[PDB]
Amino acid sequence: SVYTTFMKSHRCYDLIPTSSKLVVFDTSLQVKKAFFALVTNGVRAAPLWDSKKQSFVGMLTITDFINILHRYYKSALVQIYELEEHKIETWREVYLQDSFKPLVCISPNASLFDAVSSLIRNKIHRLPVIDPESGNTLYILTHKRILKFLKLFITSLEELQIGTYANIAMVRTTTPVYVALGIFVQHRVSALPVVDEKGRVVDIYSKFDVINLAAEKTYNNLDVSVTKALQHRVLKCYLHETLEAIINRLVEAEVHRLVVVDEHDVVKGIVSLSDILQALV
Amino acid sequence: GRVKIGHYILGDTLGVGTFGKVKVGKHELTGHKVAVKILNRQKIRSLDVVGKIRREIQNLKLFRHPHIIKLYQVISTPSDIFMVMEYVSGGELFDYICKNGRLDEKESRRLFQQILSGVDYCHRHMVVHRDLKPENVLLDAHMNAKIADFGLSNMMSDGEFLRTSCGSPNYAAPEVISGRLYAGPEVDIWSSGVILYALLCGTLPFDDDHVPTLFKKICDGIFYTPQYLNPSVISLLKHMLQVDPMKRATIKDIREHEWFKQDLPKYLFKWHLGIRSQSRPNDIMAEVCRAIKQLDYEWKVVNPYYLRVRRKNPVTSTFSKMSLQLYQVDSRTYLLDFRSIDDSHTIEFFEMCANLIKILAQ
Amino acid sequence: PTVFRWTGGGKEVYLSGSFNNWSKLPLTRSQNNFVAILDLPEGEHQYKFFVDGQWTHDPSEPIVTSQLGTVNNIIQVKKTDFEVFDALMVDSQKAPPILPPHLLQVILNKSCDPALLPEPNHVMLNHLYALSIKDGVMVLSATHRYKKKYVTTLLYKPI
Ligand SMILES: O=C(O[C@@H]1O[C@H](C(=O)O)[C@@H](O)[C@H](O)[C@H]1O)c1c[nH]c2cc(Cl)c(-c3ccc(C4(O)CCC4)cc3)cc12
Ligand SMILES: Nc1ncnc2c1ncn2[C@@H]1O[C@H](COP(=O)(O)OP(=O)(O)O)[C@@H](O)[C@H]1O
Ligand SMILES: Nc1ncnc2c1ncn2[C@@H]1O[C@H](COP(=O)(O)O)[C@@H](O)[C@H]1O
Ligand SMILES: Nc1ncnc2c1ncn2[C@@H]1O[C@H](COP(=O)(O)O)[C@@H](O)[C@H]1O
Ligand SMILES: [Cl-]
Ligand SMILES: [Cl-]
Ligand SMILES: [Cl-]
Ligand SMILES: [Cl-]
Ligand SMILES: [Cl-]
Numbered sequence: 001s002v003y004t005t006f007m008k009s010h011r012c013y014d015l016i017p018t019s020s021k022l023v024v025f026d027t028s029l030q031v032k033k034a035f036f037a038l039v040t041n042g043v044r045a046a047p048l049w050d051s052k053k054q055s056f057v058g059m060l061t062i063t064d065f066i067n068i069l070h071r072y073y074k075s076a077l078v079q080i081y082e083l084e085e086h087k088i089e090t091w092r093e094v095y096l097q098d099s100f101k102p103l104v105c106i107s108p109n110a111s112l113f114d115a116v117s118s119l120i121r122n123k124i125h126r127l128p129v130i131d132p133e134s135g136n137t138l139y140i141l142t143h144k145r146i147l148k149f150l151k152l153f154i155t156s157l158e159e160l161q162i163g164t165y166a167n168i169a170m171v172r173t174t175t176p177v178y179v180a181l182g183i184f185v186q187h188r189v190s191a192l193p194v195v196d197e198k199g200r201v202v203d204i205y206s207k208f209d210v211i212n213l214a215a216e217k218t219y220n221n222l223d224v225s226v227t228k229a230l231q232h233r234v235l236k237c238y239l240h241e242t243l244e245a246i247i248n249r250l251v252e253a254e255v256h257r258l259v260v261v262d263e264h265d266v267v268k269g270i271v272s273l274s275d276i277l278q279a280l281v
Numbered sequence: 282g283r284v285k286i287g288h289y290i291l292g293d294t295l296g297v298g299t300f301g302k303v304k305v306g307k308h309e310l311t312g313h314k315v316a317v318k319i320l321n322r323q324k325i326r327s328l329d330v331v332g333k334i335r336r337e338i339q340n341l342k343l344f345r346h347p348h349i350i351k352l353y354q355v356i357s358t359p360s361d362i363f364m365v366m367e368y369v370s371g372g373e374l375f376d377y378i379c380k381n382g383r384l385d386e387k388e389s390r391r392l393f394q395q396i397l398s399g400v401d402y403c404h405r406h407m408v409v410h411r412d413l414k415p416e417n418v419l420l421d422a423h424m425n426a427k428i429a430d431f432g433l434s435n436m437m438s439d440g441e442f443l444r445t446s447c448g449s450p451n452y453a454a455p456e457v458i459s460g461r462l463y464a465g466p467e468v469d470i471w472s473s474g475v476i477l478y479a480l481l482c483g484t485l486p487f488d489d490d491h492v493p494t495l496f497k498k499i500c501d502g503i504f505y506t507p508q509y510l511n512p513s514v515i516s517l518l519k520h521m522l523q524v525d526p527m528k529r530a531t532i533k534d535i536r537e538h539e540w541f542k543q544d545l546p547k548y549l550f551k552w553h554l555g556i557r558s559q560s561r562p563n564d565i566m567a568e569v570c571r572a573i574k575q576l577d578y579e580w581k582v583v584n585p586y587y588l589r590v591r592r593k594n595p596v597t598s599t600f601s602k603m604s605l606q607l608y609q610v611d612s613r614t615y616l617l618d619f620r621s622i623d624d625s626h627t628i629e630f631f632e633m634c635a636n637l638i639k640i641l642a643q
Numbered sequence: 644p645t646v647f648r649w650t651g652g653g654k655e656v657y658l659s660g661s662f663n664n665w666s667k668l669p670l671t672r673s674q675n676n677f678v679a680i681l682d683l684p685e686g687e688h689q690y691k692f693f694v695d696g697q698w699t700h701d702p703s704e705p706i707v708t709s710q711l712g713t714v715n716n717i718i719q720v721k722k723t724d725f726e727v728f729d730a731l732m733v734d735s736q737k738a739p740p741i742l743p744p745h746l747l748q749v750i751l752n753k754s755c756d757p758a759l760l761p762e763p764n765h766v767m768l769n770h771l772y773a774l775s776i777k778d779g780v781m782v783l784s785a786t787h788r789y790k791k792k793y794v795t796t797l798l799y800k801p802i
Contacts, residue, residue, distance in 0.1 A: 013790065019750065019760040022796040024628060029799050033780060037799050042757025049628050049798070054596035056625065108789070131789055135625040138794050284671050286644065286680055294673070326734050335731045358680070359724035360646035439788060440769040442743050462743040464766045527744045552749050552784065554772050562739050586739050608742040615739055618746065619771035621785065631783040631798045634771045638781065639802050
């Protein structure tokens with residue numbers, strides 16, 4: 001494949017920007033402060049450093065916030081005492097017990113293809129780039145960045161059949177955040193489309209929209225509907241559209257996944273940035 | 282009976298540079314002329330400039346800019362070191378300006394662009410030629426500028442300032458005459474501004490027989506702008522001759538200035554630092570040493586304010602270095618700066634620093 | 644090639660040496676220095692000077708006294724003497740400084756990508772900067788360069 005050969009040649013480094021910011025958290029940091037720091041710094045994921053281990057043990061992302069929130073929400077009347085007073089490691093101990101998952105990483109000199117493969121290989125969205133002489137984490141490689149790069153160099157959806165179209169995880173307008181978070185946990189998918197009284201799609205609650213709870217300090221109430229939640233702030237595609245023009249749509253709007261819908265604006269499936277880079281590997 | 286080096290017959294002494302005589306060389310056959318800097322090994326070892334020259338050669342041997350004198354080859358002998366370089370008939374730009382008057386807006390602009398391009402090349406190569414003057418700007422038969430004495434030049438290393446107070450006091454930056462610390466290019470800009478004034482006016486902007494008032498003027502950044510001077514270039518000089526390096530024109534801001542841009546040829550071109558304590562400097566340094574050993578960290582005392590400390594990693598079993606330096610901020614306060622020394626590196630550096638801070642003054 | 648310089652006055656000065664079968668070679672005078680340059684094989688060579696009717700040696704240069712009491716200068720032209728960097732390596736054998744304003748020009752405080760930052764002046768790289776310890780947690784930061792790119796890493800560390 002022409003795309004696959006081009007990715008096999010380009011070094012990760014070529015995608016690292018001129019001057020970037022990196023936020024690293026010591027595992028002994030109180031996990032609440034940890035999420036609050038993501039919001040304040042304007043970052044979606046951060047590497048973790050165990051001082052006793054003297055190495056990067058993992059990554060702290062929004063899924064971790066979703067996970068805690070769901071595993072530990074009791075009600076709006078009580079504090080998530082757990083979240084409020086728990087360290088990153090105290091929770092990493094709980095979250096990953098007899099089930100163990102090491103740190104996944106790439107080298108700047110390592111291939112772009114090698115990196116794209118590593119994301120699907122370990123089923124992740126954030127990849128830390130580490131230089132082996134320094135051991136220093138330099139950048140966090142994301143699907144959105146790799147795709148914007150491939151699309152920068154690029155000079156039907158029903159025929160190629162790309163994306164997930166069967167047993168699609170979605171919520172209603174009325175659905176509480178807690179319920180929705182529980183879905184993100186059981187299904188393990190980036191976003192959930194919001195459907196009306198009819199199967200038609202009105203909005204979309206993303207793994208992202210879950211940070212506003214951290215940001216606005218509103219996580220203490222998860223009984224609130226998904227629409228109530230999304231009030232702080234739609235994009236669709238059809239099966240009768242070319243992949244080149246559909247890839248073009250995702251990067252021009254800088255969206256992590258597009259909705260495959262019918263004429264009556266009723267859900268048919270979803271085509272993630274994930275699936276795209278895979279089909280091109 | 283002709284004295285030769287390479288196949289060039291050593292002729293007349295063109296001048297005496299920073300570290301040695303400069304003589305003409307006319308090729309045995311072709312008649313080609315070269316500029317030959319003679320560095321006596323025994324003398325370059327007397328002044329402890331042996332390292333300086335090693336670096337100077339290294340840099341200049343890989344540089345290739347049209348407005349910087351080319352270093353053809355360096356010939357070593359048991360006795361002396363011969364730097365074969367490009368010869369230019371025109372000689373000092375200084376004498377040009379002495380002989381002829383000041384240059385016309387058009388002619389001056391050309392030569393300023395030419396000079397600045399080279400100055401830029403240097404910087405773009407971590408080299409900062411301090412001592413930049415009309416006396417070190419040479420001209421060829423076609424009136425093209427040529428930067429020449431890299432004896433006072435220095436390197437720019439990530440995280441360090443230079444101290445040496447180099448060059449003629451007329452062209453010397455206020456911070457250089459002040460003997461304060463500097464990054465490097467700002468002091469080359471301050472000189473280039475003086476060069477620009479000299480081209481346009483044919484005199485020096487800061488100049489007096491009374492040396493203390495020459496210095497007052499420099500630190501007061503005050504110079505006279507003659508009535509013939511174009512307000513746009515006056516503007517450029519006002520920006521280039523700032524006493525504050527933080528407020529001074531950058532090689533980019535000059536490039537962007539409309540006077541410069543005109544007919545310009547294509548060929549050219551809530552955070553806190555460290556910890557701040559109000560104690561007596563001697564107490565501060567004693568406190569750092571009594572805390573560094575309180576962490577079992579190996580160190581070397583450079584200055585009574587510079588300290589090079591090393592730490593053994595208890596896990597990865599790897600050495601990690603850092604440099605500690607005290608500066609005077611206020612007339613009332615001081616601050617301990619932490620610099621990382623290159624051989625996770627960055628994280629281990631932070632940990633190293635952190636430990637100290639928790640047991641230290643603001 | 645080796646340099647032969649006679650420092651001190653004279654009308655006529657010559658170099659006799661083992662290299663030129665002790666023939667009188669005339670050194671050209673510039674000023675108070677009389678010089679000649681000639682390549683000699685990597686070996687031992689003895690020489691003397693014929694300075695205005697008298698035969699001398701440079702007292703400052705190494706000599707050798709003969710079984711016959713002949714005093715001549717000596718020169719061991721070493722392999723190392725030929726190559727510049729080989730020779731330069733062989734040749735090598737208060738008040739607190741004021742705070743440079745540069746170290747206060749940071750890239751974090753001063754729509755757009757929050758991860759993306761301005762390019763720094765080389766002078767502020769590897770320097771430790773920190774934020775006030777609020778909530779018993781220290782926040783350290785530093786900009787480091789890897790190749791032609793830069794990374795400002797900030798550690799959230801409890802104390
Ligand atoms: O002049 C020298 O040193 C000076 O010593 C002074 C002192 O104390 O004596 C200082 O004051 C002064 O600053 C210093 O540079 C030299 C050091 N090494 C040398 C090697 C050579 Cl080959 C020549 C050389 C080259 C061509 C001609 C000719 O002109 C070509 C025909 C004769 C003549 C002589 C000169 C030197
Ligand atoms: N490189 C990595 N190494 C180890 N664990 C990781 C890595 N990246 C993410 N994780 C973990 O994978 C899980 C899912 O994260 P992810 O899908 O990448 O987040 P998000 O979609 O919000 O960016 C989390 O438990 C996170 O801690
Ligand atoms: N709402 C959804 N329901 C079901 N699958 C989905 C949904 N959103 C994304 N996916 C799939 O989840 C996988 C991982 O993608 P993502 O987490 O969206 O980056 C891909 O195979 C997607 O097609
Ligand atoms: N198909 C879509 N249509 C509209 N908004 C979307 C869509 N997909 C994601 N978003 C929004 O994109 C933002 C960032 O989410 P994420 O794409 O996971 O980074 C959120 O505000 C989402 O609601
Ligand atoms: Cl001179
Ligand atoms: Cl001639
Ligand atoms: Cl010429
Ligand atoms: Cl002048
Ligand atoms: Cl002598």
